[PDB]
Design an enzyme around this catalytic site. Structure first.
Site, PDB file in Angstrom:
ATOM      1  N   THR G   1     -64.202  42.326 -11.147  1.00 18.21           N
ATOM      2  CA  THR G   1     -64.525  41.635 -12.762  1.00 18.21           C
ATOM      3  C   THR G   1     -65.646  41.418 -12.823  1.00 18.21           C
ATOM      4  O   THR G   1     -66.113  40.883 -12.040  1.00 18.21           O
ATOM      5  CB  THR G   1     -63.320  40.755 -13.071  1.00 18.21           C
ATOM      6  N   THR G   2     -65.453  40.940 -14.149  1.00 21.17           N
ATOM      7  CA  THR G   2     -66.968  40.366 -14.838  1.00 21.17           C
ATOM      8  C   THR G   2     -67.041  40.356 -16.247  1.00 21.17           C
ATOM      9  O   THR G   2     -66.309  40.949 -16.833  1.00 21.17           O
ATOM     10  CB  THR G   2     -68.568  41.043 -13.928  1.00 21.17           C
ATOM     11  N   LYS G  33     -59.622  40.928 -20.853  1.00 17.54           N
ATOM     12  CA  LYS G  33     -59.647  39.750 -20.193  1.00 17.54           C
ATOM     13  C   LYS G  33     -59.840  38.861 -21.050  1.00 17.54           C
ATOM     14  O   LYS G  33     -60.199  38.122 -20.330  1.00 17.54           O
ATOM     15  CB  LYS G  33     -60.865  39.856 -18.952  1.00 17.54           C
ATOM     16  N   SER G 141     -66.287  39.078  -9.960  1.00 19.01           N
ATOM     17  CA  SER G 141     -67.823  39.878  -8.368  1.00 19.01           C
ATOM     18  C   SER G 141     -69.350  39.985  -9.160  1.00 19.01           C
ATOM     19  O   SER G 141     -69.836  40.300  -7.936  1.00 19.01           O
ATOM     20  CB  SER G 141     -66.587  40.862  -7.896  1.00 19.01           C
TER      21      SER G 141
END
Lengths: 219, 222, 219, 218, 222, 222, 222
Positions: G1-2, G33, G141
């Site tokens: 995820t970012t 997200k 991450s």
């Protein structure tokens, strides 16, 4: 365990409640093309007698401000928790109208003084759907009445109710319904008027106040 | 255990095998793992047998209870939410080994297009859920083999019956590559169970139809 | 005053309860070939006086809506929990009829105002079984009466009860029992009628409302 | 302006008496095989005679919800007691006692007195000899030991006298039934609730006598 | 310990051995492990002796208690449920070593066909239950040998008596291959106990009949 | 410690030794381990001395308390039950080392045959109990030697006195093969204690009789 | 995820990828997200998917609840505080593995200069927060690769659109160097999601714009 006949005491309580309801500013709520219209005679700028309850459910009241205001808060409270537990489209004007009545009856029976209040809960359909506006009137004892066209609360309700009976027109626009409502309410000045709508065309939150210059232009 | 569910044009189908084990030992040859929780939803549960049957029972009770109180069923969204909350509630016991995972198939009557009102929803042990959109799902020890079978067989799905055959085949491959999943027992005559949901509600597929499909598959592979 | 005659206060309470029961819409429930038929005089479209209680157990009431409605909810509550603990076929109309009576008596003795309600609990046999429909009437004090043919609740019960006494016929079809019930109830218009049945032929849930066009065709 | 307490107590007693008076009559009498309960009961679902424990039976007259409630309380106490100690330890005497104490305390602290009249009956166990015991518990808590028969509810004088002339110890089941129905009349096959505490049964002595067999007997 | 139960046309039979051990030490030569919980159900319990006798006693009390309150016995389904809930309640203590597993035999008076109204129900430590449908069941340390014996001997079962003989034989083989299960003691005259349930209720088989069957088996094997 | 109990025609006898140790160290030469809990029951307790004396005292209190409240003693069955419940209550402390096991001898006045109204009852640490029917029982570190002695000597038991002699001898062999059990001390004149129960109640055997029996045994073995 | 967020003159932009994994296994190809919690704030959450979606939902509810009670939204400071208190509340579960970190982007209507009313706020697991002032932030991450990309690309940001392109590129490099972050899937047509907030509120960027920017980047690198 009391002297004065309980029945007599109950009658006295009813009379007191009636008197309290009578000496108050008048509010009207009526169905029009775009939803429901609340028009109240309100001089103060901070104290309000019309309020959003949930996405499509509005609320008007007449009586003693601290009490009707308190119910306002209780009603707001119940809807949010219910929505969080299940969902927004599950809270309906009907469930809310019901809660107030039961609470009022129990409260009156166990409390000292009855709430000198008169409530009107209004509901419109959601976005992109067709359904007639629903008006409920809840009285101080717990009684609840289903109104097809308009509700009048507080003060002397007879002349306003009759003037509305002659002037009412289904599917009247916003301006016409405002003229009818102010006219029947007079039975006034730009100042001291609290006007809001449950606009059925809004995507989510239907309640919307109509204040100031725009209101003046409309009237 | 293995429970597959797949959408077809106009509906949803959900099938499950029949074996239940304790270690290497085959303990139940005819367990039913797919329930009709209501007129438009079926629920399969993989995992601990006790926790599974209990979940199914209690969830059905709750759906119907709200329906009786409010005079209208929840939306498919509300149903998804309640199931998710139950699953999240079993998390402490799932870490202790009593894990049960549900796969929920439903037919949304309120959806806009009837041909795609089918719905498949999958859950993890932590109550999070996901609305499947690639057309099929599965749960249990054989789920990976079942999904890898349906990925190839899914272009054949065109109606209720072809979708049913694809379901039965996916189960057959799950059982073929995993020992905890039972295949069609031709000797005792025990076949997977299936539920079909479409515009008219949920009905159990009668056993004969599943028997014929299974025999067709078995003869095809010989 | 202070020290008074309890026997007088109790008599007054009974009179008040009687008055409350008297000023209300009338409901009838009668046995017919396919089960039990509830026919109530009800103008509102949202507020109902007839309800499913359990698979084969129905419920009608007359009096004060919030209270009879509240009992409705309590009764629904008890059956579901009991069924979950033991089973669906273990909940019977008899057990439910009993619970309401005991609750009503205790509640009246310890509360302030008696519930101005009159209840009728109905039960039919399960699918593929033969047994006569059972009607129980529970009054405001806790009294319970076993009725073989029909129950009349609320308003003036004498003329309706007599008209039914002349018109009643066991094993009358659904249409005949509807005509008899509406006729004896008149002692009306298609609108404002609440009609439901406990159809003994349904597999599980026996309660079924009869509303709108189908009802109009029947009548 | 206050009234009085003694006067109030007298009024309460009168009210209780009136409640007891306007009710169906029940009789219980000893016969050769045990004890016989014969009550005038029209309903088919509501009952005024009940098993309490293996050899202990129970009849009542008054307000159904209350006497029914005592019925339940009595059933409750016996099972727990038996589980803690044993079945043969629960006796008609202990049960008769519990109801009286409860009734007295309840009346003193409650609002309305229970318009009920109770009769607890006991017979001997299997293969043992002992006389049937009848106790009558009244609304205040009073308890009376009866050697032959108890009459409860309604007008008790004529029934009690007719039984006084007709009673015979060691009467068979049919004779005691005739005597009891006759003295009760002072009726039709329908609306009669008849049960026995048959001392000859191995464990559960209570046994209802309903329908065709009852018709044949009468 | 070992308790077998088998259906026969028109009824059910349930038999149990008599030994109770502590480790390698034989401590009880005449324990009774099969109770008549009510007029149509018998219950065997394997496992910790205390927990076993307590289960049986309390369950009988509860069945009869509801019967006295409601004026009608529970259905066989309700009975199954209550027993299951008790078993689930002992789970914490079963992990601590106090495990007790019940096997429940009953005769359903409400079933449609009288010839197959017999019922056998088995439980695990976690309260889940299963309605046996291959005609027989067993519980205890000798259960595997008993089941593998009944699988072969079961075609001989045609009535109450042949079913009884098959039960006694299955017990004999359990004891023959496991040391924790006692066989018929010809010296002290102690034989397995048996209960027969049919349309007329539950009766204990009198000892003489079991003695004759056991002597017939023993002479057959010599 | 070692406490034996044996039935004889018409009654029951119960005897116990006198030593109490801490490890290898002899700490008490005259402890009394057999109490008369009531007019028809005596109770011996092996194990932790504190827990033992407390059990005996409290049980006697409870028997007599119910007797005063209800006007009639419990049946022998009720007594058995209460003792069992006490024992079950000490289980947590018994796992911590404070274990106390009771052996209960009684004379049932309500039994049918007076010649066999004697009763012996044994308990484990988990409160389960067993009605002994092979005629004798024992508890404590010497119990195995005592039982293996009584098995051979028991055909000699024909009355109250012969039964008493057999009891004393069994104790002598327990002490002879185990060091935690004290034998008759001829130097200090301390002998086992004994209680006899028959139709007329429970009486303590006066010391002289036990002294003579012990001297007879000791001279027999020389 | 970012999830990246960057201020541009006159507004703020916030973009997030679409992948969700379990170990090495790609489990979700289209998770969203970045939420619009209110008319002037968007919230991204990295970490455990359940805890993330729950945080977002509950925070939106609370902002709007106070708004309905008091008739005026909280100041940006109050919003920051409530989010911080929620995050601090999840700390116990974050140590147990259920960690969720939010990145909050908002447009302060009450700020003095409209061109710099954009606001970016970052949180740690312990509820402390920091108002970013170097113009950009990221979480997840891939956050380090994303930040090191934006440090170089940030001088190109001059308006809403250039800022959007820089966001998408930063995501592309995150995914390029980390396997837990998904890049633009040209095959299935799934692209990062983006929210733009300026003087007029918060709007979702329609997918087509993100598709074109992603294709421009991908062709630039070939």
């Amino acid at each position: 365990p009391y002297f004065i006949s309980p029945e007599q005491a109950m009658r006295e309580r009813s009379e007191l409640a009636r008197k309290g309801i009578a000496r108050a500013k008048s509010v009207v709520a009526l169905a029009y093309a775009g939803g429901v219209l609340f028009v109240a005679e309100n001089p103060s700028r901070s104290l309000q007698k019309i309020s959003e309850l949930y996405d499509r459910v509005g609320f008007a009241a007449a009586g003693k401000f601290n009490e009707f205001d308190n119910l306002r808060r209780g009603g707001i409270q119940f809807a949010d928790t219910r929505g969080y537990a299940y969902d927004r489209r599950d809270v309906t004007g009907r469930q809310l109208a019901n809660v107030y009545a039961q609470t009022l009856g129990t409260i009156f029976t166990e409390q000292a003084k009855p709430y000198e209040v008169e409530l009107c809960v209004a509901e419109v359909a959601h976005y992109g759907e067709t359904k007639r506006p629903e008006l409920y009137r809840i009285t101080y004892d717990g009684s609840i009445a289903d109104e097809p066209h308009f509700v009048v609360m507080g003060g002397t309700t007879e002349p306003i109710a009759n003037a509305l009976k002659e002037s009412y027109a289904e599917n009247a626009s916003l301006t016409d319904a405002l003229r009818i409502a102010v006219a029947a309410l007079r039975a006034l000045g730009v100042a001291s008027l609290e006007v809001a709508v449950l606009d059925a065309n809004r995507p989510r939150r239907a309640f919307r106040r109509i204040t100031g210059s725009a209101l003046q232009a409309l009237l | 255990t293995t429970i597959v569910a797949l959408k077809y044009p106009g509906g949803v189908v959900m099938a499950g095998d029949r074996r239940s084990t304790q270690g290497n030992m085959i303990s139940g040859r005819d367990v039913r793992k797919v329930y009709i929780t209501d007129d438009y939803t079926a629920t399969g549960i993989a995992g601990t047998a006790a926790v599974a049957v209990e979940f199914a029972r209690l969830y059905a009770v709750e759906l119907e209870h709200y329906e009786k109180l409010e005079g209208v069923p929840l939306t498919f969204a509300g149903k998804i939410n309640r199931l998710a909350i139950m699953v999240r509630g079993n998390l402490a016991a799932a870490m202790q080994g009593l894990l049960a995972l549900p796969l929920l198939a439903g037919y949304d009557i309120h959806a806009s297009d009837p041909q795609s009102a089918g719905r498949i929803v999958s859950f993890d042990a932590a109550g999070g859920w996901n609305i499947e959109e690639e057309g099929y799902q599965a749960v249990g020890s054989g789920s990976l083999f079942a999904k890898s079978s349906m990925k190839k067989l899914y272009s054949q799905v065109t109606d209720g019956d072809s979708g049913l055959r694809v379901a039965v085949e996916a189960l057959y491959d799950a059982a073929d590559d995993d020992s905890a999943t039972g295949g069609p027992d031709l000797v005792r005559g025990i076949f997977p169970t299936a539920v079909i949901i479409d515009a008219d509600g949920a009905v159990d597929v009668p056993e004969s139809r599943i028997a014929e499909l299974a025999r067709a598959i078995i003869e095809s592979r010989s």
